[PDB]
Amino acid sequence: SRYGPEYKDPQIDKEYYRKPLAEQTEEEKYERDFKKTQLIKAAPATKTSSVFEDPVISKFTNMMMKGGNKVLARSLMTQTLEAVKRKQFAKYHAASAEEQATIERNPYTIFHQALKNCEPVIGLVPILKGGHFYQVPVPLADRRRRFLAMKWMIAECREKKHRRVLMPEKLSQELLEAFHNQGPVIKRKHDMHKMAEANRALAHYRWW
Amino acid sequence: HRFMEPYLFGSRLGQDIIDLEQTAAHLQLALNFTAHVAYREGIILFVSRHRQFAHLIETTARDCGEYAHTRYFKGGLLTNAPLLLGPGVRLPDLIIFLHTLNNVFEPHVAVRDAAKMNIPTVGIVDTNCNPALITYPVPGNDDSPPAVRLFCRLFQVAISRAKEKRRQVEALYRLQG
Amino acid sequence: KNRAARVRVSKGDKPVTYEEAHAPHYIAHRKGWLSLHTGNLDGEDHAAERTVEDVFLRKFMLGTFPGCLADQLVLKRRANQLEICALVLRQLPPHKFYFLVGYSETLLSHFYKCPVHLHLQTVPSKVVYKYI
Amino acid sequence: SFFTKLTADELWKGALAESGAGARKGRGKRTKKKRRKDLNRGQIIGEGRHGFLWPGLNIPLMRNGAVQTIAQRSKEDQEKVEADMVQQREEWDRRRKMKVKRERGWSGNTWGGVSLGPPDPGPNGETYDDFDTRILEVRNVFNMTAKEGRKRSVRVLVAVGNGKGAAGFAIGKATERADAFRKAKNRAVHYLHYIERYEDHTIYHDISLKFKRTHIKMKKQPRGYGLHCHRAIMTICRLIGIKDLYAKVSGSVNMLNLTRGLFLGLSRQETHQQLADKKSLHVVEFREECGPLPIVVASPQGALRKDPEPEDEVPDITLDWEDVKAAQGMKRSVWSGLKRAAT
Amino acid sequence: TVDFIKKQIEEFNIGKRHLANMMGEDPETFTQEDIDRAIAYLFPSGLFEKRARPIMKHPEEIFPKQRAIQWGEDGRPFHFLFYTGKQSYYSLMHDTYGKLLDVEKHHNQLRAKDLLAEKTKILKDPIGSRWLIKEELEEMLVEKLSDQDYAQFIRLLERLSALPCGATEEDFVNRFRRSIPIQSKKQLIEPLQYDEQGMAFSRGEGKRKTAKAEVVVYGQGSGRIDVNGVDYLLYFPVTQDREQLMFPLHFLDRLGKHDMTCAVSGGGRSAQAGAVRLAMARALCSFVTEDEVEWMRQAGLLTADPRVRERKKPGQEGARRKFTWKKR
RNA sequence: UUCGCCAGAGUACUACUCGCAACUGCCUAAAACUCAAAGGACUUGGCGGUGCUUCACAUCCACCUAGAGGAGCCUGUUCUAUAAUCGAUAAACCCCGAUAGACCUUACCAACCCUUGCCAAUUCAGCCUAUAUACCGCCAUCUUCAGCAAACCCUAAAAAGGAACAAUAGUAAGCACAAUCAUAGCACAUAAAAACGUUAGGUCAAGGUGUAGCUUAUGGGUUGGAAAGAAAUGGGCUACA
Ligand SMILES: [Mg+2]
Ligand SMILES: [Mg+2]
Ligand SMILES: [Mg+2]
Ligand SMILES: [Mg+2]
Ligand SMILES: [Mg+2]
Ligand SMILES: [Mg+2]
Ligand SMILES: [Mg+2]
Ligand SMILES: [Mg+2]
Ligand SMILES: [Mg+2]
Ligand SMILES: [Mg+2]
Ligand SMILES: [Mg+2]
Ligand SMILES: [Mg+2]
Ligand SMILES: [Mg+2]
Ligand SMILES: [Mg+2]
Ligand SMILES: [Mg+2]
Ligand SMILES: [Mg+2]
Ligand SMILES: [Mg+2]
Ligand SMILES: [Mg+2]
Ligand SMILES: [Mg+2]
Ligand SMILES: [Mg+2]
Ligand SMILES: [Mg+2]
Ligand SMILES: [Mg+2]
Ligand SMILES: [Mg+2]
Ligand SMILES: [Mg+2]
Ligand SMILES: [Mg+2]
Ligand SMILES: [Mg+2]
Ligand SMILES: [Mg+2]
Ligand SMILES: [Mg+2]
Ligand SMILES: [Mg+2]
Ligand SMILES: [Mg+2]
Fold first, then answer.
1. How many angstroms separate the CA atoms of D243 and D200, rounded?
2. Is B51 on the interface with E (CB under 8 A)?
3. Would the Cβ of A24 be found within 7 angstroms of any atom in strand F?
4. Which ranges form a coiled coil (chain A) (predicted)?
C-alpha cells in the first residue's frame, strides 16, 4: 500500500524496448507512458531480466516456500530440476536409436507439459439452494486452473511420500508421471471431472 | 386560473384573450404607484424568475438605478433580513413582478413574503397567475418578447421621469430660499 | 472516548482559553509545554526531584493567588534559579500584589534553597480564544 | 498528604454530580435540588485563624507616618471577628433559604395566565413597553430520537397585547423553558391582529364561529357585565382591551384551536360603518334604557338610498337551542347563576 | 473593522522599524524574508505545526478579506444585485453573459458581412492553462460560493471560449486562468567525471530497507564487482543476490564493460543486494544515452523502494495480526 | 322533507323471553361483576425471515495462507477444598487491574499489643466500610458512522418537517469529519484523531469524594500462614518430523 494509485507496473522485457522502430501501434503507447508523468513501481527482487528464469518456475517456487525461507525453496527447485535432468539422462542412455528421438531431456519443457496435463478443465462451486449445498460445475479461469494444477502436485508430494523420501526426488518422480499422464494428480483431476459430469444437471443453479 | 375570470375578454378557440381595457386601467395606476415610490426615495426591486430574459431584467434595473432579483430566491431573504443580507438593512419598498410564476409553475416566494412584510407589490399576471396577493396587478402577457420589452421600457421610463423630476423639484427647493 | 486533559463542549457559551481548547495530542504540535527543565532530557537525571517541586509550585501558587489566576503557571528552570511566569487578573490592588510577590520570592527561595524569580502579567480578564 | 488535594471546582463537580450518567435519560429528579456554594465569597485574603495582622493585606501600610510591623489580634478581638464571619453565614443562608414568590395566573401550580413581562425590543430599536403578555399553554412535548430516546422539548402558546385593540399569539418551542418563553415573546409580536371594539368595551355584534372542532359563541354584553368568559378568553380579551363580554365554548377545548378561532372571529367582525357603507342605510341604535330614542352610531357616507330594506314579517335567522333555552327561562342548571369573583 | 486594520497597519510599520533597529540591518532594505528570519531567531518556538509559530506579516496577509460597506447612510445599497445574496458572483455571471451576447451579436454581423478575422484561442495546452478552483474563486469573490454555482460559471466560461474571440473578452477570461508547472519527471544526469588519471568514472547512491549503498563505477575496466573489499561471489553466495546484481548490467548490455566497487552498510542479505541494484542503476545513467534511461526507469531500476517494515501497534501481534478474538 | 340507529369499554354476534319447516340454528336482546379508561387518525424513531438499486476488500460467499479445539508445559478463569482478599466476568472478561505475590507489596486470616494514636492545633485523627444505581478524574463500545448543535425564518398548526441546481424555504457561528501535524525530501501508507449520545458498561481498591455507617474498633503495629486439584475452559510456548 506504500505505492500510490499513480504508480504503474514495470516492464522487464528487454526486447520490448530494444526494437521501437519496427512498429507504430506499439510506438504510440510508450511515449505517452512517460509523457503523462506517470510513476513506475520498483522492480521486485524475485523478478529479473534473466533469460533462464520462468514466471511459472518462480510461482511454483513461491508456492513451496514455508514461512519466509526463500533460499530453501530455490534450492529445492535446483535439486528438483537437476534430478529430473539426471533421471531423464539415465533413461536416455539405456534406450535404442529410435527412442532417443522421442525422449525429452529438457526439464523446463517437461515441467510445463506436466502442468498443462495436470490443468483441470472445469471446476466445482458449492451453491446453497433450498438450505443445502450443491456442487455446481463452473468453468474456471486460466489462473485458477493453473493454480489448482500447481497446488495439487505440491500437496500430493508433501503428504503422500515416505519420510526417507526427499522432496526433489519425489517431485522428480511425479513430474515424469504427470508428463505421461500416469500420475495421481491426473487421477485427482479426472475425479473432479467425473464429479462435475455427475452433477452436470445441477449446472442450472448458477446465475453467472 | 379561477381568479382571472373578470380580467379576460373571452376565449379564441381554446386560447383565452385578455381584454386590454382593464389592462390599461390597471397599468395607469401601476405606473403611477411605481413612479411615486421612486419620487419619494423608495427602494424598488424587480423580482422575476424566468430563464429567458433575466439578462434583460438586470440591464433594465441597472439603467433605472433600482435593484433586481432574477436568480434563485433564497428562503429567508425578505423575512430573515437581519441574517441573510446584513445586520441592519432596508427592506425594498416596492416589488415589481415580471413573472409571478417560477420554473415549477408555482406562485413565487416573494409575492408571499411581500404580503407578509407589508411590502407593496405590482405585478404582471398572466392567465395562470394568482392576483389575490399582488397589491397592483396588471393582466397581461409575460411570455412574449415584445410584451415583456414593452413592460420593461414602460417601467424604465416611469422610474427615469420620477427621479429626474425629483431632481428639478429639489433644484427649485434650493432657489426657494 | 478519550477524556484526558479535555474540556467538554457545551451548548456554545462557555469561554475556553487556548491551553484548554487543545487536546493533549496537540502538545509540541500546536501548544507548548508549561514547564521547561533539563531532567526530561536523554542523558540527564533528577527528573522526579524537579517534578515534585513543579507540582508543589502549581498548588502553592494556586492557593496564594485565589481566584485571580488566569492561566496555568509557566515554570522556567535556568541555572539554579527558577522563574515563575504567571497571568493574573487585576482583582487585587497593587499594594497587595507587591506584598505577595515579595513574600513568595523569599519563602520559595528559603524552601527550595535556590533563587526564585516571580513575574506577573496583569490581564483585564480571562482571554478567550474559542467560542464564548 | 498535601499532594492528594484538588481544586474546589473539581470537588464540586463530583459533589453535585450534575453530569451523572443516571441523570441523562431522566432517572434522576427524585431529589430535585442542586446548590453549589462558593467558599471564597466573604473570604478576605489576609485574615487567618491565628488572627495575624499583615501590613500588606489586612491593615494599611502606614500609620501616624511610621511603618507598621506584624501584629496579632487579641483573644477577644479575634473572637469578635469570628462571630462576625459566622453571622455572615447565617445572613447568607437566610437569603438563600427564602423563595422569591410569583403571581398565579389560573391555579397555584400552572403556567397559564401568569405575567411574563414586556417582550424584548426589535433589531431596529422599537421597544414594546405598553405591550403585555400572558402564558396561555405550556406542554412538555416528547420526541423519539434514535440514540437519546425521549427528547424533551418545552412548548408554550403565548399571546401578547397592549390594551388598545392590537393583540396576537404565537408558539415558542425549545429544549429549555426559559428559551421557549423568550422565543414565544419575540415571535408573538410579529403576528398582531387588530380587534374592532365597539365603544372600546364590547364587540360590535354577536359572533358564532366554527373552528376545526371548537365552537365559540360570543354575545355582545352591556357595560355592567364584565368578562364572564372562559378562563383563557378572559385573559386574551384583557390583553386586547375588551372589558365587557360573554363567551361560551363547546366541543373541543384545545387551547391552540381556541385561541386561533377566537382571533379569527374577533378579526372577522363587521363595523357599523362598514354595514352602513355596504347597505347605504343609516345605522340607528335603540338603547333599552334610553327608551325609543333613535341613537345614531354610524352614518352611510356616500350615496344614501331612499329605497327601504325589505321588512321580513318572519325572520329566517339561524337560531340556537342554547339561546332559546336561555331566553325561555328553562336554564335550571345550578352552574349558570353562580356568584364568581370580579375581573 | 476598517479602522482596526488601519491601526494594525501603523503598528506593523513601527514594529518593522523597531525590528530593523534590533537586528542592526537597514530598515529600507529590510524585507519580509528578513522579518521571517528575525522572528525565527528571536522567538525560537519548536512546534511541528508551522502556523503555530510566531508570525509577523502584513495585516492584509494575516486577516481575511473583509466585506465592504454594502449600503450608504440613507439605507440604499450600492450594487444593484445586493438583494440576490451573492452580489459579486451574480455580477460576474451577469457580466459574462453580457459579453457572451456582445460576442454573439458581433459575430452575427461579421458573418452577415462575410468577414472571418478571428482565430481559435481556446487551446492553451503548451502553456498549461487551467481553470480556477473554488478556493481561487472564493479569494476573489469574498463571499462564500457553492459547488453548483462554480460549475455553472465554469460551464459559461467554456461557452465563451468556444466562440470567436476578440480583444477584450480574451483578456477578461485570461484572469480566470492559472498556469501549471512542468510535470516533467526527467531525472538529473550526473556528468561523467575524471579523477586522478582515470577515465569513465561515475558514482551512485542507493537505499532500500535500511541499507545504504555507494557504487563507484569505471567504464574503462573489465566486468567485475568488488563489494566491501571482497568479491561479489563471496559477498553474495545466494544466486538471487547475484541475479539482482546482474539485473542493471544485463538490461544495458554492460556486463563485461564496467568495473565496479560497491560499499553497502545495514540491512540483511537481500536488502544490501537491492540497495546495490538501485545505486548501480542510478550510477549507470552517465555511460548511456537518454533514450535508455527512460527504458530503465520504466523497467523499475531508477525508482526507490518505499516498502519498509511497519511499526507494531499496541494490542496486536505483527502490526496486522490481531489477538485471538473470542466472541463469547 | 323523511325513515332506521347511536348514551364509556369488557362482559356480549352472551343468558333469559317471543317468533321461525330452522332442535349444535336464525332475529330481538340484557344483568351481576371488573377498569378508568376503551377507541379513530397522525409525527418521529426502531424493526421487518417485504421488495428494489449500489456494495462488503481481510470480507459474507465464491477463494489463498498460517493457527485454535487433539498432546505436554506456562498462565488466567469457573468449580470443589481451606482460618484465608477484591474487582472484570456477551461482542467491549479470561498473561484482565498486575510493564508482575517468600516477609514487604497485601487491602485476607489466626495469634498477640496500642487506643486524641503521621500533622502546629482541632468533642480530633484514622477506615482498601457500603453505594460505580450519586461522582469527578480515566477508558471500552457503535466508531474511520457522520452527525450533533446555539441564534433565526417558513408551514391554511407546527407531534414535527424544511430538499429539487434548467433549484419548489431555507441562512447558519461552533463541535465533528475533512484539512493539517508525526514516522525529519514528496506521494501512498501507518500512527494519531473521531463530536452529541447508547450500554444506569468498567473503576469508591490510582487519587479526592456526596450520602449512610465504625471510634479501647469496620482504627493502628509485630509474628506465622494464605494450601491442594475431583473436574471443565480461554490465551500462548514446544513439537508431532
Ligand atoms: Mg405566462
Ligand atoms: Mg398550590
Ligand atoms: Mg376536556
Ligand atoms: Mg508474526
Ligand atoms: Mg354497557
Ligand atoms: Mg352470526
Ligand atoms: Mg344467539
Ligand atoms: Mg476473516
Ligand atoms: Mg503453533
Ligand atoms: Mg490443546
Ligand atoms: Mg479472584
Ligand atoms: Mg464480582
Ligand atoms: Mg459487557
Ligand atoms: Mg505479614
Ligand atoms: Mg504476604
Ligand atoms: Mg482495614
Ligand atoms: Mg456506570
Ligand atoms: Mg455533513
Ligand atoms: Mg422545526
Ligand atoms: Mg453550521
Ligand atoms: Mg512530510
Ligand atoms: Mg492522506
Ligand atoms: Mg487509532
Ligand atoms: Mg482528521
Ligand atoms: Mg452497572
Ligand atoms: Mg461492577
Ligand atoms: Mg475512597
Ligand atoms: Mg469496595
Ligand atoms: Mg489450564
Ligand atoms: Mg490476551
1. 8
2. no
3. no
4. none
DSSP A40: B
According to the entry, how was the structure determined?
Answer: cryo-EM
Tell me if there are at least 3 CB pairs under 8 Å linking chains A and B.
no
Subunits with 3+ C-beta pairs closer than 8 A to A? E
> D323 alpha carbon to ligand 25 midpoint, in Å?
66
D185 near D172, Cβ under 8 Å? yes
Calpha distance C116→C108 (Å, rounded)? 7
Provide φ and ψ at B139, rounded to 5°: -70, 120
Task: With beta carbons less than 8 A apart as the criterion, state whether D128 and D189 touch.
Answer: yes
* DSSP assignment of E55-105: ----HHHHSPPPPPP-B-TTS-BSSTTGGGS-HHHHHHHHHHHHHHHHHHH
CB D240 within 8 A of CB D266: yes
DSSP label at residue A8: B
Kindly give, in sequence order, each residue whose CB lies less than 8 Å from that of residue B116, ignoring residues fewer than 6 positions away.
B78, B79
**DSSP string of B23-54, one letter each residue:** HHHHHHHHHHHHHHHHHTT--EEEEE--TTTH
**D3 CA from centroid of ligand 14 (Å):** 29
Does residue B156 sit at the E interface (CB-CB below 8 Å)?
no
Angle formed at CA D88 by CA D83 and CA D89, multiple of 5 degrees: 100
Quote the crossing angle between the two packed helices C47-64 and C94-112, to the nearest 10°: 150
Comparing CB atoms, the residue among E274, E304, E308 nearest residue A45 is: E274
Task: Give the closest residue to A156 by CA, choosing from A166, A177, A171.
Answer: A171
Cα A41 from Cα A6, distance rounded (Å): 9
D256 touches strand F (CB under 7 A): yes
Q: For residue A171, how many other CB atoms are within 10 A of its CB?
A: 26
Q: Does C29 touch chain E (CB under 8 A)?
A: yes
The rounded distance, in Å, linking the Cα atoms of E247 and E276 is 11
C-beta atoms of D57 and C55 within 8 A: no
Residue C66 to residue D3, Cβ atoms within 8 A: no
DSSP class of A41: P
Name the one residue in this structure whose C-alpha cell is 366541543.
Answer: D251
The CATH number of whichever domain residue D158 belongs to comes to 3.30.230.10
Taking the CA of residue C47 and the nearest CA in chain D, the distance in Å comes to 17
Give the resolution in Å: 3.4
Judge contact between E178 and E129, C-beta under 8 A: yes
Report, in angstroms and rounded to the nearest whole number, the Rg of chain C calculated over CA atoms.
Answer: 17
Grid cell 420620477 in the structure block, residue = B162
**Do E228 and E263 contact (CB within 8 A), yes or no?**
yes
φ, ψ of residue B146 in degrees (nearest 5): -60, -40
Say how far residue D236 (Cα) sits from the centre of its chain: 11
